[PDB]
Write a protein that binds this DNA or RNA. Sequence first.
RNA 1: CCAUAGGUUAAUGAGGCGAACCGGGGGAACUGAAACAUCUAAGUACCCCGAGGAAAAGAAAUCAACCGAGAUUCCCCCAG
RNA 2: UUUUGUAUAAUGGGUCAGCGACUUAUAUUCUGUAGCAAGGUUAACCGAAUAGGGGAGCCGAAGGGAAACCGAGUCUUAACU
RNA 3: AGGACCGAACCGACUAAUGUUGAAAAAUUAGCGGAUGACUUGUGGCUGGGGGUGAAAGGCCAAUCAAACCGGGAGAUAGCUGGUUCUCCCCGAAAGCUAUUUAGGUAGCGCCUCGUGAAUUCAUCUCCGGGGGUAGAGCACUGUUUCGGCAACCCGAUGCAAACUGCGAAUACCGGAGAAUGUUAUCACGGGAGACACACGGCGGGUGCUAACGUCCGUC
RNA 4: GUUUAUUAAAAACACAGCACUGUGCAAACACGAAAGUGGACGUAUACGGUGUGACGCCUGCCCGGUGCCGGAAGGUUAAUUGAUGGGGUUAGCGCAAGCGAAGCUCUUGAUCGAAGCCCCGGUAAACGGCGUAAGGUAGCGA
RNA 5: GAACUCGCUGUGAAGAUGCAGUGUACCCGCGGCAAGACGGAAAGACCCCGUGAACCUUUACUAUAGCUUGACACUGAACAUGUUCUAACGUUGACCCGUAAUCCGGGUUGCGGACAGUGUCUGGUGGGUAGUUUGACUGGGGCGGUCUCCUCCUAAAGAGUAACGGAGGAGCACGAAGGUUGGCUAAUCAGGUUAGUGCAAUGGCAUAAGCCAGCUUGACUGCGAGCGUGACGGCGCGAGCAGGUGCGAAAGCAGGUCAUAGUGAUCCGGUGGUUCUGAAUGGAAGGGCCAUC
RNA 6: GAUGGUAGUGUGGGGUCUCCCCAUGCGAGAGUAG
Lengths: 64, 74, 50
Amino acid sequence: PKIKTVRGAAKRFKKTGKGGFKHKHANLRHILTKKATKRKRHLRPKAMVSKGDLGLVIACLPYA
Amino acid sequence: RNGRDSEAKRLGVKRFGGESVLAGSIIVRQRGTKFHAGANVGCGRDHTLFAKADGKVKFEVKGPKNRKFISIEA
Amino acid sequence: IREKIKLVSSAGTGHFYTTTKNKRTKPEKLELKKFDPVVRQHVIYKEAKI
RNA sequence: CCAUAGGUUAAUGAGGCGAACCGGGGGAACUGAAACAUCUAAGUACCCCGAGGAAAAGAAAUCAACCGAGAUUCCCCCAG
RNA sequence: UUUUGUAUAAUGGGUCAGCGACUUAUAUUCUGUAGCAAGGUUAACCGAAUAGGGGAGCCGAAGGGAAACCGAGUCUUAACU
RNA sequence: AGGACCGAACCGACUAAUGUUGAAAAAUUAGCGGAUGACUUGUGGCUGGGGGUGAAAGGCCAAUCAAACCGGGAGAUAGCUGGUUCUCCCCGAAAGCUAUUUAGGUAGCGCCUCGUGAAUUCAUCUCCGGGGGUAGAGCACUGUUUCGGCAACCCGAUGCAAACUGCGAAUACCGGAGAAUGUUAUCACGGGAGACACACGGCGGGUGCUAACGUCCGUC
RNA sequence: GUUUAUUAAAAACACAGCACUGUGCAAACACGAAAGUGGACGUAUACGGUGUGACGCCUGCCCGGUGCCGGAAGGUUAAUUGAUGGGGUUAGCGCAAGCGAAGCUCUUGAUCGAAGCCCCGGUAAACGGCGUAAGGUAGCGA
RNA sequence: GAACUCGCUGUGAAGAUGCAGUGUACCCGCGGCAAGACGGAAAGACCCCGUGAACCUUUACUAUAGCUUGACACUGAACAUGUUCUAACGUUGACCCGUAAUCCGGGUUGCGGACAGUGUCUGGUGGGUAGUUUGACUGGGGCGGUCUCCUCCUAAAGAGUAACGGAGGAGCACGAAGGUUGGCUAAUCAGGUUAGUGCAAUGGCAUAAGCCAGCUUGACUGCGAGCGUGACGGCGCGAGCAGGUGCGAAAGCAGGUCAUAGUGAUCCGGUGGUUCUGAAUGGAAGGGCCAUC
RNA sequence: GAUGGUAGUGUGGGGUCUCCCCAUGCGAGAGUAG
Ligand SMILES: [K+]
Ligand SMILES: [K+]
Ligand SMILES: [K+]
Ligand SMILES: [K+]
Ligand SMILES: [K+]
Ligand SMILES: [K+]
Ligand SMILES: [K+]
Ligand SMILES: [K+]
Ligand SMILES: [K+]
Ligand SMILES: [K+]
Ligand SMILES: [K+]
Ligand SMILES: [K+]
Ligand SMILES: [K+]
Ligand SMILES: [K+]
Ligand SMILES: [K+]
Ligand SMILES: [K+]
Ligand SMILES: [K+]
Ligand SMILES: [K+]
Ligand SMILES: [K+]
Ligand SMILES: [Mg+2]
Ligand SMILES: [Mg+2]
Ligand SMILES: [Mg+2]
Ligand SMILES: [Mg+2]
Ligand SMILES: [Mg+2]
Ligand SMILES: [Mg+2]
Ligand SMILES: [Mg+2]
Ligand SMILES: [Mg+2]
Ligand SMILES: [Mg+2]
Ligand SMILES: [Mg+2]
Ligand SMILES: [Mg+2]
Ligand SMILES: [Mg+2]
Ligand SMILES: [Mg+2]
Ligand SMILES: [Mg+2]
Ligand SMILES: [Mg+2]
Ligand SMILES: [Mg+2]
Ligand SMILES: [Mg+2]
Ligand SMILES: [Mg+2]
Ligand SMILES: [Mg+2]
Ligand SMILES: [Mg+2]
Ligand SMILES: [Mg+2]
Ligand SMILES: [Mg+2]
Ligand SMILES: [Mg+2]
Ligand SMILES: [Mg+2]
Ligand SMILES: [Mg+2]
Ligand SMILES: [Mg+2]
Ligand SMILES: [Mg+2]
Ligand SMILES: [Mg+2]
Ligand SMILES: [Mg+2]
Ligand SMILES: [Mg+2]
Ligand SMILES: [Mg+2]
Ligand SMILES: [Mg+2]
Ligand SMILES: [Mg+2]
Ligand SMILES: [Mg+2]
Ligand SMILES: [Mg+2]
Ligand SMILES: [Mg+2]
Ligand SMILES: [Mg+2]
Ligand SMILES: [Mg+2]
Ligand SMILES: [Mg+2]
Ligand SMILES: [Mg+2]
Ligand SMILES: [Mg+2]
Ligand SMILES: [Mg+2]
Ligand SMILES: [Mg+2]
Ligand SMILES: [Mg+2]
Ligand SMILES: [Mg+2]
Ligand SMILES: [Mg+2]
Ligand SMILES: [Mg+2]
Ligand SMILES: [Mg+2]
Ligand SMILES: [Mg+2]
Ligand SMILES: [Mg+2]
Ligand SMILES: [Mg+2]
Ligand SMILES: [Mg+2]
Ligand SMILES: [Mg+2]
Ligand SMILES: [Mg+2]
Ligand SMILES: [Mg+2]
Ligand SMILES: [Mg+2]
Ligand SMILES: [Mg+2]
Ligand SMILES: [Mg+2]
Ligand SMILES: [Mg+2]
Ligand SMILES: [Mg+2]
Ligand SMILES: [Mg+2]
Ligand SMILES: [Mg+2]
Ligand SMILES: [Mg+2]
Ligand SMILES: [Mg+2]
Ligand SMILES: [Mg+2]
Ligand SMILES: [Mg+2]
Ligand SMILES: [Mg+2]
Ligand SMILES: [Mg+2]
Ligand SMILES: [Mg+2]
């Protein structure tokens, strides 16, 4: 049978031009008042999945 | 009653005397100023000394207080 | 003891800042001039409920 | 009370069996979730009823998108 | 065999003969190899046909952005050194 | 008269020995209790599994009972234990970190392998440029301590310290330069892992009794 | 008398006797999706449940807790009911900004509302306690 | 497993027929005895472990049969909220018939009567019954203690480094305790920080980082060369650029606080905003994005 | 603030091994002349 996508992963990662994955940063959902503006501003832009994590992500997203 | 400690903070000299740096590079992390900001060096809010220019690290005993200064030589 | 509050723009945009306040010691509503990035001017911001 | 229940006889049919497939009435748990209750296993196993050479479904109170298609069924895509 | 470590007084086997454990299907990725190449390949099905037909599709030649949208750029921001 | 008495049949099963691959998957032998009763026995019947039945021991329900047996779901699940079959050649670990309802499991990273690619990329040594606060030492500081002089403080002499420092090595580590040597020994990316129970010995230590073939780190 | 068939026969179980409690008969209660059936072809001197265990002398104090029984003023409170406010849409009216009826619709949740619970009493041969509800009496006691 | 199967003292996976050294011992039965072969028997039942099982308990959790409450239905009339009524409904009263029948049905009558009872919904109660949960570390387990964060020592002069090792703290505070400019300098009773630091410890602090006053909101928004630290999620330091602001005469300094604790991923949802999306179309709902809870 | 000696120590080896010693390299602190 076809491999099933991990559907949670597909909602959190998107495949880039050269095959890496961008994700949204953690720590910007709530408890925002105590956080520095500098901290929160740097958590806005999407970031790339790191080398160690790529194997985990690719397993989850076989039709990425 | 014991059995506590905190995470080690990875303070210390990151670039030693005569190493080439880019501007922005951290030179020492510290609590307070064991080392002081010399020429072409800033002092961050946690007393991190960092290069303001590209160049080489230069530590020096300088001042009347025998104090240790970090400077970047061009 | 400190309670989170909304500093809300007088400019009429909806840019709010957030901060804390000891309401027991400072019962009066806090007011500060701060940069509103919608209108791009320093305007009066006045305390409101979080 | 007319009646109706009831009673008797006649004619006709049914009954019971059979591997799967088919429609319907009921319907688990182990298991997976690295525990577990939502969830899963699964409308599966199993029990029951009924049928036929097949069954079921079927000629739009259907889709579509302002263009159009034209009952049902099955196969390949769409698409993990 | 299991262990840091077994002649071990740890495990298993009385012996022989026969049998006894990484498979199969589908999807996906990488390597090798073959074909064709900015293209490649068809599925069901048709066909008496391992032929031939069938290009429905799928993958690829473009990316960026949550998206509208823009496009060798695009997003970010009022705007980028 | 009697859940009366003694005692066979009959029904039991208190003690001991034997037997324990038995004569027997519960008996035999010698004794033992009830023996007109809430007694005992033949034949047949009824109660069915979270159910029965129980003068209640979780007893008994076909030599099976804190949920019978048979078939099915079924190859339940098994982070556990065992086992895993012909040959040669090359390379060759780990028993660590981090996280974990985690600790004998697993994941990422470290270490192994195979491939691709590329810098004098890497190592040793020499010279050069660095930061140390350890060993040692010391006693001005924080404390501790002895003696003398004066008597609140301080001074002279003398020691002690992992959490003392007016000092301070060797080494190690970072960076730069140069030669020789070394099958690129280096780094990156990609395919495949295993491993995350370590042991002893040397050195530096915590713990323990400078006890342990003890225990916990660092390093060889 | 009974019991762990097959390591326990006993001080265990049962027992007559005692007490509490339920039960008015289509009884309570039990088996049963139900129909029924047992209880019983019995009827409170009966039947079920519970504890105690011949007989003798006896069985003290505590109702604060938990349960059970009784009460129902007051509070709280379900389905139900859908006031009242707000939104969506758009006939209209706006040169435009907006506004906006009705209908439909999304939401809000007033009012109504029982038992229970809180609350007020009772009850220990109810579960229990006996230096706070009350502090262990009689008898007995290494 | 195979045996050509001695003692002793050592050694050694730490209690040896098999190793070392040494002693003793011709080959082979038969009757006896059980000290050893950690003899045979049963994948230890004790003990621990497994995110095993079962059954049992309860004021563990979640359900649920049963019991119980009310609304609506079956379910009506007349008067007044209650009472009367009969016709639904009940009857495990009587009688009649089917019928030879203590079943059942139909009929007649009595009694009860819109009650009771049952269905759906609903609150209560509910170990009666069911499914499950009930952490880990640990010089065995339990009991005790501990679990995240900060500071010091252990830590072997870069970083890092364990133990149920040795000592202490945090889970905030502050619109001033922030920013800047200008002043100002302690403990203590002789001197120079031996004081001060919003709160532990360490490192800092006179250019004060201490203290005071005036003026202020840079406790700014968008970004960010480069770097530190992490397996990763992350976390941290940061010139400089754009916009706009404060203090200062100006150079300048200011993106919170002497620094290092004062913290919680994701999901789900709330609030406001929005050159986004809007399942025929316009809207809307919902979703996205931004800010925040 | 020398010199000298002492302490420590990298590498290799050794012992009577809680501690030392030898070879070689590095070599304080304190104190002293000044
Ligand atoms: K289940
Ligand atoms: K599991
Ligand atoms: K073992
Ligand atoms: K054994
Ligand atoms: K393959
Ligand atoms: K290929
Ligand atoms: K760009
Ligand atoms: K059963
Ligand atoms: K791993
Ligand atoms: K590899
Ligand atoms: K070692
Ligand atoms: K007996
Ligand atoms: K009471
Ligand atoms: K020997
Ligand atoms: K023997
Ligand atoms: K009624
Ligand atoms: K331990
Ligand atoms: K032990
Ligand atoms: K600026
Ligand atoms: Mg948000
Ligand atoms: Mg620390
Ligand atoms: Mg599970
Ligand atoms: Mg037929
Ligand atoms: Mg048909
Ligand atoms: Mg048309
Ligand atoms: Mg072992
Ligand atoms: Mg050996
Ligand atoms: Mg042996
Ligand atoms: Mg063996
Ligand atoms: Mg074993
Ligand atoms: Mg064996
Ligand atoms: Mg595209
Ligand atoms: Mg007798
Ligand atoms: Mg018997
Ligand atoms: Mg006998
Ligand atoms: Mg007798
Ligand atoms: Mg007799
Ligand atoms: Mg028992
Ligand atoms: Mg039996
Ligand atoms: Mg069971
Ligand atoms: Mg199954
Ligand atoms: Mg199996
Ligand atoms: Mg080799
Ligand atoms: Mg951590
Ligand atoms: Mg020392
Ligand atoms: Mg020290
Ligand atoms: Mg070097
Ligand atoms: Mg492990
Ligand atoms: Mg380990
Ligand atoms: Mg270990
Ligand atoms: Mg180790
Ligand atoms: Mg040692
Ligand atoms: Mg030792
Ligand atoms: Mg050991
Ligand atoms: Mg007797
Ligand atoms: Mg017995
Ligand atoms: Mg016996
Ligand atoms: Mg009856
Ligand atoms: Mg009794
Ligand atoms: Mg008694
Ligand atoms: Mg009430
Ligand atoms: Mg009373
Ligand atoms: Mg021996
Ligand atoms: Mg013999
Ligand atoms: Mg014998
Ligand atoms: Mg044995
Ligand atoms: Mg075992
Ligand atoms: Mg009713
Ligand atoms: Mg219950
Ligand atoms: Mg239970
Ligand atoms: Mg289960
Ligand atoms: Mg369980
Ligand atoms: Mg444990
Ligand atoms: Mg260090
Ligand atoms: Mg070191
Ligand atoms: Mg540590
Ligand atoms: Mg380590
Ligand atoms: Mg370690
Ligand atoms: Mg520790
Ligand atoms: Mg960059
Ligand atoms: Mg500007
Ligand atoms: Mg502060
Ligand atoms: Mg502070
Ligand atoms: Mg939800
Ligand atoms: Mg929105
Ligand atoms: Mg629409
Ligand atoms: Mg010298
Ligand atoms: Mg000297």
